[PDB]
Design a protein around this ligand. Structure first.
Ligand code: DGT
Ligand code: DGT
Ligand code: DGT
Ligand code: DGT
Ligand code: MN
Ligand code: MN
Ligand code: ZN
Ligand code: ZN
Lengths: 561, 561
């Protein structure tokens, strides 16, 4: 919250950490950050301490083998419910040793073997107690245990604070599983999500859910998991998640044999092979984000009221170099740092390899294993400032610099569509301090996310997907597209048509709908917006404590007041 | 640990908090703390933030009714396993909003109703599936669910870090329960503890276990839970805990109709009644500890090499006043503080009453509800310095000051036998900086705990209990007695004789034995101590990673290196 104790403690460390960063980070990089030329993310954590950002947790390797967690040498779980109980504790622990999001990829496949152990236990109990209908007891009890295991997970993640006093920022993916255990997990996740959280069944912010969609798996009428696709459509319409990823487009962009889950919100690894040619996903991470204020490049290239193309080329080149220096500055902090810093990450399997206590952690990140993020924002406002559409062109050129950086250093730089929940305002506020109200750019008080078409443009779902799709193939380090839609709870067919179009043309996709609930009557209709707050169409209730109203106005779900 | 991330963050807040305390706390109090005249505990937390110390969590009230926990409006659990899963999350949350220990009192009684719901569910499943042996299916499955629920608890508490990067400091009491559900919980706790933690079955530091012992319940051959007493003796001999409390002596000292569990290690409330005359235990807390260096009073009253009684009376009176000023200083910090600071504690039931967000938290503590702790230490070294035994006499006089303080302020001051894990060295080191090596006092490098007879005195178990017993009736705010014993795993009868003697004469009691395990062979015999480390009698292994060696050399269990 803010005045809550663990948050206050965290703010104290955050302040000490900003001060230490002022002594570690070269002046020109700091100055560029204060002025809003760039944005060095997570300065209240790094480089004062050698934290990394987000990751794909290697849960499979952890669970299969042993691993130490806290003071406890955990063994392979022998039931599904214990497996997600351990998954929940790893969630809290990983969140406390990085400043970014934690992702568990393909939990349907990974947790499958523990649903199998639960099933065998009940089969053993059907013989032990002379149960007449044996195959129906084992299945029915297993269905219940799995439902309960993922209710446990969803609640644990919403009832525990990490180091920083907040609920852990975690995402869960699924959808490539077709075996009966893998189907059951997916239905359990989606059904718990539909039921909602707590007494009143509210819409949770976390975990993020993302489902993979593929032809031959869950995309068309005839596919095996097509019933699960319909469950997911109902869930999306009541609770926003799950977002979907097109397995086909995802693998083309990443170069991966299997769909690549996003770390945190939408950071994507590209394909990487270990020393024996195996494709590795789980365990890999991102080292940080620096974000380039693209509108500011253009604003600073104005001479009078007129754009100067030559000036723009000079500052662009100069600012790209600058961003490399900022990104490299923090990676340099990681030199000499030992694996004692975060045993759960480095010693015990979360990052997929066991380092010894006295090993340097940075060697793990080298030669393309970890990604590193050059963010950007405000293509819409860039296009207005330069007078034409240069989005695909400037982003393609940014990739060309990134390739050079990758080859000079060994670190795998990628272009990242910064989620920028509040950075949209920060950059605009600082650009306003210099240039004032500029028509169509700073006047509204925010910059538009990445390559997204303006939220104030009159466009259909289908035409927005088309305009945005090309960018998923360019900003390979991170991207998503949203479409705004009304209540779709009694129009699952229209929603599905937008999913299918999205899955055909782009990588990662979500749909922003209104998800409201009046507690006193029970209406799940969209509330109408007053100047005071929200109001119930059918009853007329206006108390915030007697309703749940969730939008995704930017990146995360939240209540808009 | 130390270089582990959440710990480093916590150290940053701890440093900022010490600095803020330097601006909040009057100079004379700070100076007295630097010099080791007194010790203001937890200065790295309070008064920079308005934390409190330890508590008895009102789990019963929380579970029975609703309560919000994190973002989730939790409902009454409908199974035992969910109940301890919620108990585990409350543990982590309470630990993060106070700087002291969390206690769940009488978990056998409190969690009983959820064992009853689990039993009814399996009875319902015996009819649903035509199970031949119905009463034996429900009982056998319930036994398993309870075992699993308390394995879940013991592991959750050892696999989660609170705000401060440490495993939560938590204690669990039981033993007054005689119903079949309450027996089953006690056996589950004790059996999990016996099995140990993890792959290798190591001895856990936490949770602390304390069992109540009473005539007519579990003390003599004919008592109903006498079998549980034997389970507890076996557990104590393999894992140190459980400590025991004499229900009879405990109620006489506290004035309570039911046995009073210790908050954290050994802070005891005295009896208190709400506005309608009900005796309240659960929800109540302690506001902090200031500890009086008793040897230093005597050392500072030496004129040449000779004790001056008159000087001792003057500094004693002056230092008691000083301690009141230090204790009151931090309680003053709590004025104006609102319940938004810690919703789990103040709004949602942990402290047993629901305050509104805009309510002041200090009113909850007034008029005897919360205790406040005047610690002391080193009676043994005090007796040497003054030339005679003045322990019962000086402590009785300290109570007389405390009664005056209580009547002037409304806050319930009590005399507290400071556990002083490392304060035993701190005080001795600072007293040495002034007076050097003093025979029998500072020469060994530590002061003896509270009223405990010297750890270097040749005395039997029974004679140590007798010497120490009177002090449990005087230092009512906190006390314990230890006895040192050899391996007692194949002598449960000798151990029981010491428990019975203890239960007759004193309040709260534990037995320090050696609990070692060699992993390579499996010996549970006492390891022999070398200058290098520990060594296995029968095999000869010396690697610390291939063994588990636990002592209680002071207060907590730990590995001595
Ligand atoms: N002007 C303005 N700045 C804000 C607001 N909320 C947060 N900021 C600032 C503080 C942060 O350094 C920066 C970005 O915050 P975000 O919410 O986008 O992400 P986050 O809090 O994780 O910060 P970070 O990306 O790690 O720097 O913007 C706001 O309402 N207005
Ligand atoms: N913290 C936490 N809360 C849970 C867990 N499982 C359920 N809850 C929450 C949600 C409910 O508000 C409350 C009561 O839940 P239940 O005992 O009814 O759990 P469940 O639905 O799995 O069993 P049920 O089908 O109702 O018999 O506790 C868990 O593993 N951890
Ligand atoms: N001389 C000396 N002082 C120590 C050692 N370890 C800790 N201290 C200091 C720092 C603490 O302010 C003080 C008491 O520490 P304790 O381990 O008894 O308890 P705790 O860490 O909870 O500190 P506190 O009671 O809150 O001040 O003694 C040591 O090995 N030697
Ligand atoms: N974090 C956590 N660990 C648990 C829990 N229950 C058991 N564990 C740990 C201890 C073991 O090292 C490992 C595997 O435990 P199990 O799946 O065998 O649990 P349990 O003994 O209740 O079932 P079982 O009798 O073996 O079929 O996980 C829990 O609720 N939370
Ligand atoms: Mn097991
Ligand atoms: Mn339920
Ligand atoms: Zn309504
Ligand atoms: Zn051995």
């Amino acid at each position: 919250d803010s005045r809550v104790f663990p948050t206050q403690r965290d703010l104290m460390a955050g302040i000490v950490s900003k001060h230490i960063a002022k002594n570690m980070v070269p002046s020109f990089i700091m100055k560029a950050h204060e002025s809003g030329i760039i944005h060095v993310h997570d300065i209240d954590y790094s480089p004062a301490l050698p934290f990394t950002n987000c990751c794909l947790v290697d849960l499979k390797g952890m669970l299969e083998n042993g691993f130490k967690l806290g003071n406890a040498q955990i063994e392979t779980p022998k039931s599904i419910g214990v497996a997600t109980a351990i998954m929940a504790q790893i969630t809290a622990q990983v969140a406390s040793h990085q400043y970014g999001g934690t992702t568990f990829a393909n939990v349907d496949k990974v947790l499958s073997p523990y649903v199998k152990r639960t099933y065998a236990k009940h089969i053993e109990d059907a013989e032990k107690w002379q149960i007449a209908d044996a195959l129906n007891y084992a299945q029915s009890k297993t269905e219940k245990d799995v439902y309960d295991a993922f209710q446990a997970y969803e609640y644990e993640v919403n009832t525990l604070f990490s180091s920083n006093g907040q609920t852990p920022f975690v995402t869960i993916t699924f959808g490539t599983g077709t075996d009966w255990t893998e189907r059951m997990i997916q239905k359990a996740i989606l059904k718990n999500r539909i039921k909602g959280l707590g007494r009143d069944g509210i819409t949770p912010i976390f975990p993020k859910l993302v489902m993979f969609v593929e032809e031959g798996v869950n995309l068309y009428k005839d596919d095996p998991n097509y019933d699960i696709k319909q469950l997911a459509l109902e869930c999306a319409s009541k609770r926003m998640y799950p977002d979907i990823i097109s397995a086909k487009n995802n693998k083309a962009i990443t170069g991966s044999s299997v769909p690549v889950s996003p770390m945190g919100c939408r950071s994507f690894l590209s394909v990487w092979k270990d020393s024996t040619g195996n494709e590795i996903l789980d365990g890999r991470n991102n080292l940080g984000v620096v974000t380039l204020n693209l509108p500011r490049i253009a604003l600073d290239s104005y001479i009078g009221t007129q754009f100067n193309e030559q000036k723009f080329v000079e500052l662009f080149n100069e600012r790209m170099d600058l961003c490399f220096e900022a990104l490299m500055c923090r990676i340099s902090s990681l030199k000499g740092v030992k694996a004692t810093v975060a045993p759960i990450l480095y010693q015990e399997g979360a990052f997929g390899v066991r380092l010894k206590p006295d090993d340097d952690i940075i060697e793990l990140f080298k030669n393309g294993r970890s990604s590193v993020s050059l963010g950007y924002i405000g293509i819409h406002e860039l296009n207005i400032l330069v007078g034409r559409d240069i989005g695909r062109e400037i982003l393609t050129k940014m990739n060309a610099h990134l390739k050079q950086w990758t080859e000079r250093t060994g670190f795998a730089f990628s272009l990242y569509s910064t989620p920028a929940e509040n950075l949209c305002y920060r950059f605009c506020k600082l650009d306003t301090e210099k240039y004032g109200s500029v028509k169509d750019v700073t006047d509204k008080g925010w910059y538009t996310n990445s390559f997204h078409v303006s939220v104030e443009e009159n466009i259909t779902p289908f035409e927005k997907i088309s305009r945005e799709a090309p960018y998923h193939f360019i900003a390979t380090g991170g991207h998503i597209s949203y479409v705004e839609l009304p209540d779709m709870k009694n129009n699952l067919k229209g929603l599905e048509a937008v999913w299918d179009y999205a899955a055909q043309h782009l990588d990662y996709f979500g749909v922003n709908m209104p998800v409201d609930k009046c507690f006193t009557c029970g209406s799940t209709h969209e509330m109408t917006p007053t100047e005071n707050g929200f109001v119930c169409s059918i009853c007329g209730e206006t108390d915030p404590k007697k309703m749940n109203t969730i939008r995704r106005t930017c990146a995360y779900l939240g209540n808009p007041n």
